[PDB]
Design an enzyme around this catalytic site. Structure first.
Site, short mmCIF file in Angstrom:
data_model
loop_
_atom_site.label_atom_id
_atom_site.label_comp_id
_atom_site.label_asym_id
_atom_site.label_seq_id
_atom_site.Cartn_x
_atom_site.Cartn_y
_atom_site.Cartn_z
N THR D 84 38.08 38.67 42.00
CA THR D 84 39.50 38.51 42.33
C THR D 84 40.36 39.35 41.41
O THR D 84 39.87 39.85 40.38
CB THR D 84 39.92 37.05 42.12
OG1 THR D 84 39.66 36.70 40.75
CG2 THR D 84 39.14 36.12 43.06
N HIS D 85 41.63 39.50 41.77
CA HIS D 85 42.59 40.15 40.87
C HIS D 85 42.57 39.46 39.51
O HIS D 85 42.54 40.12 38.48
CB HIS D 85 44.02 40.08 41.41
CG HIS D 85 44.34 41.13 42.42
ND1 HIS D 85 44.32 40.89 43.77
CD2 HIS D 85 44.68 42.43 42.26
CE1 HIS D 85 44.66 42.00 44.41
NE2 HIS D 85 44.87 42.95 43.52
N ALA D 86 42.61 38.13 39.51
CA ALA D 86 42.61 37.39 38.25
C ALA D 86 41.35 37.67 37.41
O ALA D 86 41.43 37.85 36.20
CB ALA D 86 42.78 35.89 38.51
N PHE D 89 41.61 41.69 36.35
CA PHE D 89 42.85 42.19 35.78
C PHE D 89 43.65 41.09 35.08
O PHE D 89 44.58 41.38 34.32
CB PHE D 89 43.74 42.85 36.86
CG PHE D 89 43.08 44.02 37.57
CD1 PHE D 89 42.56 43.87 38.86
CD2 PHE D 89 42.98 45.26 36.95
CE1 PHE D 89 41.96 44.95 39.52
CE2 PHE D 89 42.38 46.34 37.60
CZ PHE D 89 41.86 46.18 38.89
#
Lengths: 84, 90, 82, 90
Positions: D84-86, D89
């Site tokens: 995921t983005h989380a 990043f």
């Protein structure tokens, strides 16, 4: 040292963006802080925030059709023709 | 070596930049890099595909609010528009 | 309706200065960004730099640590168990 | 043909996605596209360079919140991370 961002917005847009963001574990205020942090760090906007406007689209449509397009032989001839 | 084109709108955009006393040396150097196939561009130009259904178009930053839009294919380089975000996207 | 977000004052000032240079306010950027998010059902690119785990993985890979080979897609998929 | 690599972190990320019942076929289809140099990718993948002090790294979206990070050089394709983005990043 803690201020507020306050922005008028269409309520339906707000709800939809909030749904999209909630899907990824983010809130609207999260996206605001993340975005402003990037802007302040880079002194520039995130990419691709807006589509080309009508003038840009029209220039592109014209060029794609071959209308009002001009040739150049190289950098010198190009700059000369542009007056720069 | 790619064929070199520019659009009429680009001519206008370039005149406007001059008139506004923009630093034409920055733009000219970027354009020379493009013509010379010096690709990918140096990172400072933040070069990226144009957000558009129009294929081959790219967007490079002369300055944070000075954009160059151009088309790049295997045979073609075309200078399309240049200006501020407001001028091109606003 | 309104968007309301707590933020560090100095961050707000720096962002506001950048945007003012482009004839924009923070509220303009907020509307523009939320509009893009709503329409695309996705985030704008590169909002955050790679995190500590991603960076560590890249450093290891670059130094030749914990890097594995595959001969083709079948070999790869078998090795990853997918 | 490109040499193919994957990082240990990648095998872990893959097992993690697999564990939470993600459609691993979406990822495989993308990876196969990369391996076969069927480039550039379908637009849905939103493929773009990774922003880092490391040239060659790219970022493609299997889903709006399912990202593949890979390195792509003339002679190498390395699968680096996915998640995921989380997770990548955040």
């Amino acid at each position: 040292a803690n201020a507020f961002v306050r922005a008028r917005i269409d309520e339906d847009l707000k709800n939809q963006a909030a749904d999209v963001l909630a899907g990824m574990g983010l809130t609207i205020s999260d996206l605001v802080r993340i975005t402003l942090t990037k802007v302040a760090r880079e002194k520039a906007l995130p990419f691709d925030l807006r589509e080309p406007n009508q003038l840009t689209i029209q220039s592109i449509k014209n060029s794609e059709a071959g209308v009002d397009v001009h040739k150049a032989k190289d950098a010198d001839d190009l700059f000369d023709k542009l007056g720069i | 070596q790619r064929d070199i084109e520019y659009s009429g709108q680009f001519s206008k955009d370039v005149k406007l930049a001059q008139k506004r006393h923009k630093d034409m040396n920055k733009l000219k150097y970027l354009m020379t890099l493009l013509i010379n196939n010096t690709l990918p561009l140096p990172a400072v130009y933040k070069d990226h595909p144009l957000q558009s259904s129009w294929k081959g178009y790219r967007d490079a930053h002369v300055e944070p609010d000075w954009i160059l839009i151009y088309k790049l294919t295997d045979k073609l380089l075309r200078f399309e528009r240049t200006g501020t975000h407001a001028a091109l996207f606003g």
